[PDB]
Structure formats: C-alpha cells, structure tokens
C-alpha cells in the first residue's frame, strides 16, 4: 500500500495504525510516511470501507521537491535603482542563482554609497573586492584617492546588499608610531620616517615606496598621496634614489596592507549604470568561496529569466523580485557571520516563490529522503538567504495538527 | 486528453494544438484547460510519442480550490497585543471568518485608544457602534462623558483594526447658532437655548431634555453634562416641568443627533482585557451589513482553530496571524470605501495561508468554472482583505509564461 488520493477530488489520506487520516499537502504526506511516494488515485468507494481519523497536516506549503543538478554555487544578489538623482530612486532588490548575462566590474570602476539611513552608522565605498567606510567630508583625501572633481552623489542601498559583501578596514592613513622620526635602518639625510620615497625603477620613470623603522614599503601612488595629504613632513617632493641603493638598503616591510588601491578610480554613474550587483560564488571542489562585484545598466540576470522575475512580499527582509526555475534545496551554513538565530551546518529548502524551510540534526536523513533531495545540497551564505520568505517548520512532529 | 501527471514524477502537461506543454501547478493547468479536472496518471512512455513545447505556467501558487458551504458572512478582524500591555508586543491581528468563542461588548464597556500609536493624528474611542475622534486633553469633558477618575492610559493600535471599523462623526459639543439666545417657541422666563430641563418622568424622579429654537430634544444625561460644561449660561441647575407642560408647551421635536452615548462608560483595561475585536457580519439574506465590537482577554476565535492557527508578520497590510480550515474564495466588495485600486464586485480567492487572488470581469465565468468554485461566494469588505496580500494574478492569458 502506498499513500492515496481520491479518483475524483484528490483528497489526501493514509492509514496508519488501523485507521485512515487526512492531511493537507503531499510534501507533508511524504513527510508523514517517511518515503518519497506519490498519492495514487483510488476512489473513495474504497475509503469508506476503512475507518477514518481526524484532520492532520503541517499547513502552508510546499508541493514539489525538484532540484537542478548544477553543483556550482552561483549566487547573484543584486540591487536595481532607477530614476537617478532625485532623492529616492525606484527599486528592485533582485536575486538569481545561476549563470547570467554579463555586466561585471571593470577594475578601474568602484562606487560610493550612502549607508542605509542612520543610525546604521557610516558612509561606505564599494571597492574592487570589499566595502570599506569612508568619511567623504575630506574632499582632498578622496579625490587624492582619485575621484573626479565633484562627481559625488551617493546612493541609498538595500540592507541585504550592504550585508552581502564583507567589510574592509577604513579609509584614512594608518596611525604610525612616531612618524617623521628616525627609522632603525637609517638612510641618507633628508628622509623622515612614515614619508614617501620615489625611485626611478621603470626604464622611463619611477615607482613609489614608503619608509617604516625596518625598511621599505612597496606602495601605490594612491597611498603616497594619502600620506602626503596626511603629512608633507615639511617637504615638497620625495627624492629619487638608486636601485643599487635599493638593493643596498634594508628591504623589509612592516606590513601596512594596501586595501587602498593602486589606481585612480573610475566613478560609476547611476544614470549611466544603475544596477549594482554582488556575485557570491563557491564552485564545486572549492575550499573557500570567492566574491565579485558586477555593475551595469542592463539587468544582468539570465536570458529568459526576465519573463519570470517573480516578486515576493513582506519588507523586513525581502521586498523583492526573484527569478529561477522551479525550486531547490541548499546546504546552509547557519554557522556563519550571525545567521539570524540558527547556528549549524543545516539544510534550508527554498521555493520558486522563495520561502525558506529547513532541517535540524534531530531531523534525520529520512526527512530529505522522503523529500528525495540530493545528499549534497549547495553551500550558501546567510546574507543572500535573508532575502527570502520564512514559512513554518518541517518535522513529522509538527504535521500532527487538529 | 486531460491534465497529465507522470506516474513517477507527476510532471504536468496538457496537450493543446498538436503538442505538449510543461506547466507549473495544477490550478494553472485547470486555468489552461478551462475545466475543473484532475491530473491523469500515465507514464512518460506515452508522452515521448508526442512532441513537446517549452515551460509555461503561472508562478507561485495555489494547490486546490475548496470552499466551506457556510454562506453566512461572518468576519472577525481582531487586535491582540500578545504579551499583554507593554508599548511593543507580539502583534496578532487575528482573522477568523466563522462563529467564535464568547467575547461580548457590554453597553457600558467602551474602550479608549490613541491613534496608530502617536504621532498619528488625534486620539480615538471605540464605542458601541464605531470609532470616534476625541482630543483627551479636556479632562472635564471626557470625565463628564463618564470616565473613571484618571483611568486613562490609552492604547496603541494597529492600523488594520483602525481602518476596520468605520468612523462615526466627531466628539465635541456641537456648534449651535446663537446658543443662549431666544427660541422661536418661547418657554417660561429663565431658559436660554442650549439648556436642559428635567421632569419626574421616572415616577420617582427626573429625566433630561435639551432645547432648540423650535422645541425639545430627548437627550442623555451625558449630553446634558456636555452642554452644561459647554455653557452653564450662568445657571447652576436645570429646572423642573411636568408632562402637562411637556405637551402643553410645544413638544416641537427638533433634531441634533445623539451619536453621543446614554450612559457612563466602563473603561476597559488592556491588562485585564487585551484583545479587542471587530465582528463584521453580513448574513445570508441581508441588505446592509451589521458590525459589532468584541472584547476580552481570551483569544476569542473558535475552539480548535488555534492549533491550526497560522502566524503572521510582514508589514504592508497584515503583520497579523490567521486561522481557518483549507481555503476559500469570496465575492469581495471592491465596491467599497476606497478598496485600494479595484472597483467592482470582484472575486478574490484566498488560501489557508491567506494570499489574495483577484478575478476581473474579462476573467469570465470560465475562470471560476475551471476553479470549480460556487456561483455565490461571499460578500467581503475591503478592510479585512487588506490584511491579506497578492501573489500572482490569475488568468489563462497571463499563464503563457516562459
């Protein structure tokens, strides 16, 4: 005997014990039986011969446990502004998870952003890789970082996009213990420590280093402008030095890491390129995940998915359009950077609508087995997962309803 | 030649033209066929013999179209500050549509409230009938309306219940053209217009009536205290007349409305009684819908309905819980007091999850026919429907999806 549905009305029932029992939907039915089976169509002219109990079933949802065989974790969380430079823009926060049409970041491009309105603190800069806070009050520092002359108009952000990208340390010059003083490797006369040196190292021209107490620092031009804005040390220009002296001087870096760039930055325009996008990716056979930024004016979602840009509801999370094929189930690391309340390597199932469900440790392999999902679901971070809806729990216990 | 689900995978197809088409859910399949039918179970070893198109189907939802044959229009939209009486609570707005457990309103019981918690304009009061705005800074007026001695610690309120009940006219003393002056019917000497008179109409003692330029008004003692604190006209007390005089002087019944009450008011305490409720009922064979106010501390919905209750959040309408059996579809008045956008007697289908699904007129009887729903669904007001929200639209036209 399998689990049953009526020849006419498809009413959901199974006998357990010695008695029939109605339930709500077939996913809960498979959950009850602990088997991935289908309710076969037999008329109630059987059913009436058998004694029947009372109404059961975990309410709400879902209906089909399909899944796509793509084991590579593509994740596109995204934000689309529109109508650039009034105060507030028209909005999508879109979301897809597959290969997609191209609108990536060119390495010169990076973009300023206002934080999602204060007291969520700060004003931020979307980098090559990361986000890092910048007080844009000092114009000389950030145009010395390479902005265009007053091309500044920040954009509001979705909080999910803002939590999607990991954050970098802030944008000032680092505080240096007794800069301007003498280092402990002691070059020729005019140099103070914490300053910049220049040296002819191209056959045409020069490249740029800095001074700590130990030795030299291979730095960008941008860091040099940063420190000369920080302290000129009473000195106009750095002096050029010999490469034989460069080999002859202590080559040792006290590591003041450059998250600061190498280049002047192309500024993105929200009229010219509204949609800014975070491409989280952990492929199969990867030990640690990667992240890129995408940016364009075309919606970079995959072709054919624009017909099925499906909207959710319920701001406080997602007010959001999404687009996929029929739904899936993914291996959530609720062990992560504060994923709501739950903390485990767990599994969360997700609909084509995009409502979340999931699995405990007390929820065994019988759960996913009756759902018939793959033994290996997909790794997924939390900040993309916070843009979904939250349904009821899943267990064989919670289906026992009145 | 019907709806077809696979004997193993239950994949959904109906052949049209000459070819097959994969679709999403069986409700959309019935929508395609235009007939309420069932997915027949045949193997793919037939399917392969027939050429196949691309994927179609309305995304999202629903499963099936049941309906409960109670044609009585019972509706409960409720407010429950669970975690009784702090400023911030767990917000249930309960939505049953049936009979329920006892939560009355005794006629002395009527409940003060702030607006949708301040800065929303004004303070309000829930009456026997309706809600009415009142500024409560005039303490003498409202305790002259009959408050207890400083029992005022009013309530916050969700906007859903505040838009559930219609508003009554305002709550001050009415502006009277030349009150205190001379009438046109001219009683014995001391009387100003806008004054009150008593008579021993209870065979013990008095009963209270106000005056216009034409004659008399049957007023409450509450209204008498209202006009008394409005203007005493330098007079301490009403005079006494007799029924001989009540008829003999012209009982020329002018009218200024007594929406104001008849009695002192039992002020309800939200710690004693948190849940306050609106019983919108249009019975079968009704010309106009009745409305009551309900009140208590017990969650007043039907017995057994709380184990199958469904929780609620997600502002943009309901942040509010719901409770029913499997779902229904109603003859909703979008002919009402600003029903959002639609203006028709329009059918909205609604799940046990509580997602609305509107039906147009160009969406003809074929739609409800293929859904198999009854030709007489239930008249529903807008303000309870606003405590649902929309998934996709429903037609065979928009079911042509990629």
Contact present, A8 and A14 (Cβ < 8 Å): no
List all residues 6 or more positions away from A17 whose beta carbon is below 8 Å from its beta carbon: none
Give the DSSP H/E element, type plus range, for residue B277. Answer: strand B275-282
Burial class (CB in 10 A: 0-12, 13-18, 19+), B349: buried
List all residues 6 or more positions away from A69 whose beta carbon is below 8 Å from its beta carbon: none
The Cα-based distances of A351 to A356, A357, B61 in angstroms read 7, 9, 11
The Cα-based distances of A145 to A142, A234, A262 in angstroms read 4, 21, 9
Give the residues across from B95 on adjacent strands: B77
Question: Of A331, A325, A347, A379, which Cα lies nearest the Cα of A68?
Answer: A325
Instruction: Establish if B59 touches chain A: CB-CB under 8 angstroms.
Output: yes
List all residues 6 or more positions away from B335 whose beta carbon is below 8 Å from its beta carbon: B343, B344, B345
Which tokens hold the place of B219? Answer: 């007023």
d(CA B112, CA B120): 15
Which tokens hold the place of B272? Answer: 């004693």
Interface of B with A in 115-134 (CB under 8 A): none
Vertex B327: Cα angle to B323 and B332 (nearest 5): 95
Contact present, A376 and A71 (Cβ < 8 Å): yes
d(CA B60, CA B69): 27
Q: Do A38 and B10 touch (CB under 8 A)?
A: yes
Would strands B378-380 and B328-333 be described as parallel, antiparallel, or unpaired? parallel
Contact present, B342 and B390 (Cβ < 8 Å): no
Question: Of A91, A97, A136, A129, which Cα lies nearest the Cα of A114?
Answer: A136
Phi/psi of residue A95, each to 5°? -160, 125
Q: Is the N-terminal amide bond of B131 cis, ω within 30° of 0? A: no
Contact present, B193 and B183 (Cβ < 8 Å): yes
Contact present, A268 and A111 (Cβ < 8 Å): yes
How many whole angstroms from its chain centre is CA B296? 17
d(CA A230, CA A62): 59
Give the DSSP H/E element, type plus range, for residue B209. Answer: strand B208-211
Instruction: Establish if B11 touches chain A: CB-CB under 8 angstroms.
Output: no
Mutate to test the interface with A, among B11, B41, B59 (most CBs of A within 10 A): B59
Contact present, B98 and B326 (Cβ < 8 Å): no
CB burial readout A350-372, b (16+ within 10 A) else e: bbbbbbbbbbeeebeeebbebbe
Phi/psi of residue B166, each to 5°? -70, 155
Contact present, B320 and B387 (Cβ < 8 Å): yes
Question: Of A342, A389, A315, which Cα lies nearest the Cα of A116?
Answer: A315
Question: Of A95, A87, A83, A78, which Cα lies nearest the Cα of A156?
Answer: A87
Q: Do B314 and A314 touch (CB under 8 A)?
A: yes
d(CA A254, CA A256): 6
Tell me the resolution in Å: 4.6
Contact present, B132 and B123 (Cβ < 8 Å): no
Which tokens hold the place of B394? Answer: 């429903």
Question: Of A208, A273, A304, which Cα lies nearest the Cα of A78?
Answer: A273
Q: Do A402 and B24 touch (CB under 8 A)?
A: no
Contact present, B179 and B194 (Cβ < 8 Å): yes
Instruction: Establish if B269 touches chain A: CB-CB under 8 angstroms.
Output: no
Q: How far is A357 from chain B (nearest CA, A)?
A: 15
Residues of B in Cβ contact (< 8 Å) with A43: none
Which class would CATH give A4-47?
alpha beta
Q: Is the N-terminal amide bond of A61 cis, ω within 30° of 0? A: no
Would strands A275-282 and A123-126 be described as parallel, antiparallel, or unpaired? unpaired
Q: How far from each other are the two terminal CA atoms of chain A, in whole angstroms?
A: 25
Q: Do A59 and B308 touch (CB under 8 A)?
A: yes
Contact present, B13 and B22 (Cβ < 8 Å): yes
d(CA A41, CA A39): 7
Neighbouring C-beta atoms of residue B26, cutoff 10 Å: 21
d(CA B119, CA B111): 20
Residue with tokens 């039986």: A33
After which residue numbers is chain A interrupted with C–N beyond 2.5 angstroms?
Answer: none
Q: How many residues does chain A have?
A: 402
Assign B97 to helix, strand or coil. Answer: coil
Q: What is the largest CA-CA distance in chain A?
A: 105
Which tokens hold the place of A200? Answer: 């002819």
List all residues 6 or more positions away from A209 whose beta carbon is below 8 Å from its beta carbon: A196, A197, A198, A199, A216, A217, A218, A219
| Candidate from B64, B392, B401 with C-beta closest to A307 | B401
Contact present, A233 and A195 (Cβ < 8 Å): yes
Would strands A389-390 and A355-359 be described as parallel, antiparallel, or unpaired? parallel
Which tokens hold the place of A124? Answer: 């931020």
Experimental method: cryo-EM
Question: Of A95, A93, A96, A94, which Cα lies nearest the Cα of A70?
Answer: A96
d(CA A181, CA A194): 8
Instruction: Establish if A316 touches chain B: CB-CB under 8 angstroms.
Output: yes
Which tokens hold the place of A41? Answer: 């169509």
Phi/psi of residue B221, each to 5°? -60, -30
Residue with tokens 């199969």: A284
Residue with tokens 């710690």: B271
Q: Do A308 and B24 touch (CB under 8 A)?
A: no
Contact present, B176 and B211 (Cβ < 8 Å): no
Contact present, B400 and B32 (Cβ < 8 Å): no
Minimal-distance CA residue of chain A relative to B66: A9
Q: Do A315 and B313 touch (CB under 8 A)?
A: no
Can you give chain A as a three-state secondary structure string?
CCCEECCCCCCCEEEECCEEEECCCHHHHHHHHCCCCCCEECCHHHHCCCCECCCCCCCCCCCCCCCCCCCCEEEEEEEEEECCCCCCCEEECCEECCCCCCCECCCCEEEEEECCCCCCCCEEEECCCCEEECCCCCHHHHHHCCCCCCCCCCCCCCHHHHHHCCECCCCCCCCCCCCCCCCCCCCCCCCCCCCEEEEECCCCCEEEEEECCCCEEECCHHHHHHHHHHCCCCCCCCCEECHHHHHHCCCCCCCCCCCCCCCCCEECCCCCCCEEEEEEEECCCCCCCEEEEEEECCCCCCCCCCCCCEECCCCCCCCCEECCCCCEEEEEECCCCCCCCCCCEEEEEECCCCEEEEECCCCCHHHHHHHCCCCCCEEECHHHHCCCEECCCCCCCCCCCC
Contact present, B107 and B114 (Cβ < 8 Å): no
| Candidate from B10, B304, B326 with C-beta closest to A24 | B326
The Cα-based distances of B361 to B23, B57, B341, B384 in angstroms read 25, 21, 15, 22
Contact present, B294 and B99 (Cβ < 8 Å): no
Instruction: Establish if B1 touches chain A: CB-CB under 8 angstroms.
Output: no
Q: How far is B259 from chain A (nearest CA, A)?
A: 39
Q: How far from each other are the two terminal CA atoms of chain B, in whole angstroms?
A: 23
The Cα-based distances of A289 to A169, A346, A397, B38, B137 in angstroms read 20, 18, 36, 46, 62
The number of C-alpha atoms within 13 Å of B348 and in the hemisphere containing its C-beta is 25
d(CA A130, CA A121): 17
Query: What single string gives the DSSP state of each residue in B115-147?
Result: SSTTTSS-EEEE-SS-EEE--TT-HHHHHHTT-
Neighbouring C-beta atoms of residue A139, cutoff 10 Å: 12
d(CA B64, CA B57): 15
CB burial readout A8-38, b (16+ within 10 A) else e: eebbbbbbeeeebbbbbbbbbbbbbbeeebb
Q: How far is B11 from chain A (nearest CA, A)?
A: 10
Neighbouring C-beta atoms of residue B28, cutoff 10 Å: 26
Question: Of B25, B71, B81, B75, which Cα lies nearest the Cα of B324?
Answer: B75
d(CA B314, CA A314): 4
Question: Of A71, A62, A132, A282, which Cα lies nearest the Cα of B62?
Answer: A62
d(CA B301, CA B354): 17
Which tokens hold the place of B308? Answer: 């199958």
Question: Of B51, B153, B177, B76, which Cα lies nearest the Cα of B387?
Answer: B76
d(CA B264, CA B109): 9
Q: How far is A4 from chain B (nearest CA, A)?
A: 13
| Candidate from B60, B307, B315 with C-beta closest to A401 | B307
Q: What is the DSSP letter of B33?
A: H
Contact present, A205 and A165 (Cβ < 8 Å): no
Contact present, A61 and A255 (Cβ < 8 Å): no
Q: What is the CA radius of gyration of chain B?
A: 29
d(CA B318, CA B305): 19
Which tokens hold the place of A37? Answer: 């089976």
Assign B293 to helix, strand or coil. Answer: strand
d(CA A185, CA B285): 99
Q: Do B391 and A40 touch (CB under 8 A)?
A: no
d(CA A24, CA A57): 5
Phi/psi of residue A218, each to 5°? -70, 105
Contact present, A380 and A346 (Cβ < 8 Å): no
Which tokens hold the place of B316? Answer: 């943009």
- State the CATH architecture for B3-47: 2-Layer Sandwich (3.30)
Residues of B in Cβ contact (< 8 Å) with A38: 7-8, 10
Residues of A in Cβ contact (< 8 Å) with B60: 310, 352-353
List all residues 6 or more positions away from A115 whose beta carbon is below 8 Å from its beta carbon: A121, A122, A123, A124, A157, A162
Would strands B290-296 and B275-282 be described as parallel, antiparallel, or unpaired? antiparallel
Which tokens hold the place of A202? Answer: 């191209």
Which tokens hold the place of B238? Answer: 């009403």
Q: What is the DSSP letter of B305?
A: T
Vertex A134: Cα angle to A130 and A137 (nearest 5): 160
Neighbouring C-beta atoms of residue B96, cutoff 10 Å: 24
Contact present, A382 and A340 (Cβ < 8 Å): yes
Query: What single string gives the DSSP state of each residue in B40-95?
Result: EEE-HHHHTTS-B-------S-----------SEEEEEEEEEESSSSSS-EEE--E
Contact present, A288 and A92 (Cβ < 8 Å): no
| Candidate from A41, A59, A313 with C-beta closest to B314 | A313
Give the DSSP H/E element, type plus range, for residue B5. Answer: strand B3-6
d(CA B35, CA A181): 88
d(CA B328, CA A21): 22
Which tokens hold the place of B233? Answer: 């006209």
Question: Of B355, B375, B357, which Cα lies nearest the Cα of B365?
Answer: B375
Query: What single string gives the DSSP state of each residue in B323-361?
Result: E-SS-EEEEEE-SSS--SS--SEEEEEE-SS-EEEEE-S
d(CA B212, CA A174): 84
Q: How many residues does chain B have?
A: 402
Q: Do A315 and B310 touch (CB under 8 A)?
A: no
């Amino acid at each position: 005997n399998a689990i049953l549905a009526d020849r006419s009305t498809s009413a959901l029932y199974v006998r357990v014990g010695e008695q029939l029992h109605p339930v709500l939907n077939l996913t809960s039915a498979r959950l009850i039986s602990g088997s991935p089976d289908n309710p076969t169509m037999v008329k109630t002219s059987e059913i009436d011969k058998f004694p029947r109990g009372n109404l059961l079933g975990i309410p709400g949802a879902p209906e089909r446990m399909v899944q796509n065989a793509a084991t590579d974790a593509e994740w596109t969380v995204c934000d689309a502004v529109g109508g650039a430079n009034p105060g507030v823009t028209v909005i999508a926060g879109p979301l897809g998870a597959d290969g997609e049409r191209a609108a990536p970041l060119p390495p010169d491009h990076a973009v300023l952003v206002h934080s999602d309105a204060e007291p969520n603190p700060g004003d931020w800069l979307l980098w090559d890789g990361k986000r890092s806070p910048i007080d844009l009050a000092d114009r000389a520092v950030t145009d010395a970082l390479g902005l265009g002359g007053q091309a500044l108009a920040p954009r509001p952000i979705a909080a999910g996009l803002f939590n999607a990208v990991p954050a970098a340390p802030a944008l000032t010059a680092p505080v240096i213990p007794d800069a301007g003083a003498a280092p402990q490797f002691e070059l020729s006369l005019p140099v103070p420590v914490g300053a910049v040196v220049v040296a002819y190292d191209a056959d045409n021209t020069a490249r740029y280093y800095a001074v700590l107490s130990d030795g030299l620092q291979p730095i960008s031009p941008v860091l040099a402008a940063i420190l000369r804005n920080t302290d000129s040390h009473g000195f106009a220009q750095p002096p050029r030095l010999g490469p034989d002296e460069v080999a002859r001087t202590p080559m040792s870096r006290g590591l003041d890491t450059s998250a600061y760039p190498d280049n002047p930055v192309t500024l993105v325009e929200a009229s010219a390129h509204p949609v800014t996008c975070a491409h989280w990716t952990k492929p199969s056979d990867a030990a640690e995940s990667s992240l890129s930024v995408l940016s364009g004016a075309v919606l970079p979602l995959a072709e054919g998915l624009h017909t099925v840009d499906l909207v959710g509801a319920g701001a406080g999370g997602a007010a959001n359009r999404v687009a996929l094929t029929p739904g899936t189930g993914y291996f959530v690391q609720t062990v992560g950077a504060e994923p709501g309340s739950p903390t485990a390597g767990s599994m969360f199932w997700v609909s084509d609508t995009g409502v979340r469900y999931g699995i405990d440790t007390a929820e065994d392999d019988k759960v996913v087995a009756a759902l018939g999902l793959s033994t290996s679901p997909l790794p997924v971070p939390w900040s993309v997962l916070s843009q979904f809806a939250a349904g009821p729990a899943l267990s064989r216990g919670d289906a026992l309803v009145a």
